Amino acid sequence: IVGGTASVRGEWPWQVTLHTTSPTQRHLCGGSIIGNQWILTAAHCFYGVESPKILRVYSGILNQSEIKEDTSFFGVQEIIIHDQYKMAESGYDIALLKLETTVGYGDSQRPICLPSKGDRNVIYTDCWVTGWGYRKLRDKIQNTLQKAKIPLVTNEECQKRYRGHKITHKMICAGYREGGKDACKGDSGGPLSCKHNEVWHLVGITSWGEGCAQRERPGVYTNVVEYVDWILEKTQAV
């Protein structure tokens, strides 16, 4: 996160750190708890990931230094990638991780609500992007979970900023016209969480952008409201 501040423990209890054990143990992507055995994340995170066996999900983490070999985690049973996904820049940048065991909800880990399909006509004014990603394009993975308040940008305005790309209504952008606050490397897959009527909603999934926090280059997120049916299809299968 560029231009963010340290989060407080328990602030974003739906936020997870997805780690990989191949070739070495490292943070791979962010993710969000959406159900007791479900993590919502980005499809681009699994480029070259051949098996769910190399993945570990850690919930209730403020600091990456909390993670050692004796730290509890959730194994991944299945990786479900949207079948229309080709690349982040083209959309459908969404995936579900079915966990091998259920998450016990508490004050350190709980699910974030998905946006209500009836509320596609609501204006979100209190949106935050969170993650352990870089503070600048040439940086490193942060120990403490960072947060940044970012204003949502219209599809029309975001399309003006990305000449040569096709910003679809399945994408949602956020950023200041002058830049300064954004997601960066390591933040992808994480949430863009918006508080409306005292309830937090998973409005976006960190996906792509031209550099980090550049002037007139908003961050591009998967517009979660447009995938509610797909999430229900996959999580509520008979």
Ligand X SMILES: O=C(N[C@@H](Cc1ccccc1)C(=O)NCCc1cc(Cl)ccc1-n1cnnn1)c1ccc2[nH]c(=O)cc(O)c2c1
Residues 9, 98, 185, 195: which binds ligand X (CB under 6 A)? 185
Q: For ligand X, which residue of 133, 145, 202, 223 counts as binding (CB under 6 A)? A: 133
162 makes contact with ligand X (CB under 6 A):
no
- The residues pairing with 98 across neighbouring beta strands, listed in sequence order, are 38, 78
Cα torsion angle, 150, 152, 157, 159, sign? positive
The catalytic site residues sit at 44, 93, 188
H or E element at residue 156: helix 155-161
Is residue 192 within 8 Å of 127, Cβ to Cβ?
A: yes
Q: Does 136 bind ligand X (CB under 6 A)?
A: no
45 belongs to the binding site for ligand X (CB under 6 A): yes
Which stretch, 78-86, 110-118, 142-150, 211-219, contacts ligand X (CB under 6 A)?
A: 211-219
Q: Please tell me the distance from the alpha carbon of residue 217 to that of residue 178, in angstroms, as a whole number.
A: 9
- Residue 147: name the closest of 217, 89, 200 by CA: 200
Q: What is the DSSP letter of 22?
A: S
**161 labelled ligand-binding:** yes
Q: In this chain, which of 26, 86, 136, 160 binds ligand X, going by CB under 6 A?
A: 26
Known binding-site residue numbers for heparin: 160-163
- Which residues bind to ligand X, rule: CB under 6 A? 26-29, 44-45, 47, 133, 141, 182-188, 206-209, 211-212, 219-221
